[PDB]
């Protein structure tokens, strides 16, 4: 989720993704640890048995056959990590996430409590306000005339620059906000 | 005057007091869950009495206490039935609810 995707996946990338999916579903089928280790080592041997194929056409055919076998033999109810996109606690703590700009709307009575926090917040806001134009200029200079091909962004290169478009990545609410 | 009716009505009546207090300076403190659990436990131990009365003499009642509205021939009134089913189910549900709220005290601590 953190990295900019590419225009396509390469053959090795699809191979590795299939390897990971097969291992995870085999673990879902083989609940106990020793049985899973046995069958995972068997799968790894089966997987690197065709590791040295110089013919790419046969390599893609083998990949296609492997994917067909995976789809036939997949677990209908595979294990999902609780916070993963399919887990039982995936978006559980989203309702507790509040954006930072809401703090601007607090009553001065509410801001009377926590004075040091709001002083630090003012420092951060000043930093962002000062850095914005330099970020825009750096993005303008680095980018090609046609436009940006990928979603990757450049880092800060100068003496006191901040990486462009940093405010909404740095000021993420939290993973467990409340 | 046959405390069966009074106790059966009080059991259901006292369950609403925390709902009315939900706008006081107890709904903002950390003592509200314990207050609600204590109320439910008190309701259960109070409801135990009509069950004993029914188990003794088989006493059953209907209480049509409030007349809500009347159509031309159909009269609609706030009426409660205290036969075997009601007096046998109320204590069981109150007991289970008391246990479950005491459990939720620990389970939902970080909410």
């Amino acid at each position: 989720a953190f990295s900019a995707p590419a225009a396509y996946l390469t053959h090795q990338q699809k191979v590795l993704r299939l390897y990971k999916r097969a291992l995870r579903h085999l673990e879902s089928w083989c609940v106990h640890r020793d049985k899973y280790r046995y069958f995972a080592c068997l799968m790894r041997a089966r997987f690197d048995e065709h590791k040295n194929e110089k013919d790419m056409v046969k390599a893609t055919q083998l990949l296609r056959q492997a994917e067909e076998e995976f789809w036939y033999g997949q677990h209908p109810q595979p294990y999902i990590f609780p916070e993963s996109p399919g887990g039982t606690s995936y978006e559980r703590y989203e309702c507790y996430k509040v954006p930072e700009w809401c703090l601007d709307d607090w009553h001065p009575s509410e801001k009377a409590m926590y004075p040091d926090y709001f002083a630090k917040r003012e420092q951060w806001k000043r930093l962002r306000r000062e850095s914005w134009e330099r970020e825009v200029k750096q993005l303008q200079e680095e980018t090609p005339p046609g436009g940006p091909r990928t979603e990757a962004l450049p880092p800060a290169r100068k003496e006191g620059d901040l990486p462009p478009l940093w405010w909404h990545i740095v000021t993420r609410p939290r993973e467990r906000p409340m | 005057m046959n405390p069966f009716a009074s106790l059966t009505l009080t059991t259901l009546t006292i369950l609403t007091i925390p709902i009315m207090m939900s706008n006081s300076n107890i709904y903002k403190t950390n003592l509200y869950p314990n207050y609600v659990k204590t109320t439910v436990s008190y309701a259960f131990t109070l409801s135990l009495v009509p069950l004993l009365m029914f188990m003794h003499t088989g006493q059953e009642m209907i209480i049509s206490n409030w007349h809500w509205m009347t159509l031309q021939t159909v009269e609609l009134s706030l009426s409660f039935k205290m036969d075997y089913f009601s007096v046998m189910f109320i204590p069981v549900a109150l007991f289970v609810t008391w246990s479950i709220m005491e459990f939720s005290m620990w389970y939902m601590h970080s909410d």
């Binding site: 225009a7 990949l63 036939y72 962002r128 436009g147 979603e151 | -």
Partner: protein, 128 residues
Amino acid sequence: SFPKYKPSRLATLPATLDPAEYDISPETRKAQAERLAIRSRLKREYLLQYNDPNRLGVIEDPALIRWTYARSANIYPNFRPTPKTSLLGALFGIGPLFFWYYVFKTDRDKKEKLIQEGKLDQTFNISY
């Protein structure tokens, strides 16, 4: 070797089971590069306004405006009376009305005929 999977409307075909993604061409790679370039340009345009310190309000999305306008106000200008449109309109806007009319009329005729003969068991039927 294994029993095959047949896609449907509500159960679509997986990407890994798609034969178009296994027989690829340099034209396909160029198309993917162009799609990524378009997406990256849109993402940069959005992020420039998202992170603007001086921006207060909502970031207007032309795609959402186009979607709502097409779903609401662009429908009648693009309507033509065709045999398909006429048949579907007549069916879906006429058939249910007469179906329900026939059902209700038959039911009430039966009830009235039964009442006339005096055999309906209308005892205690005070409220209507």
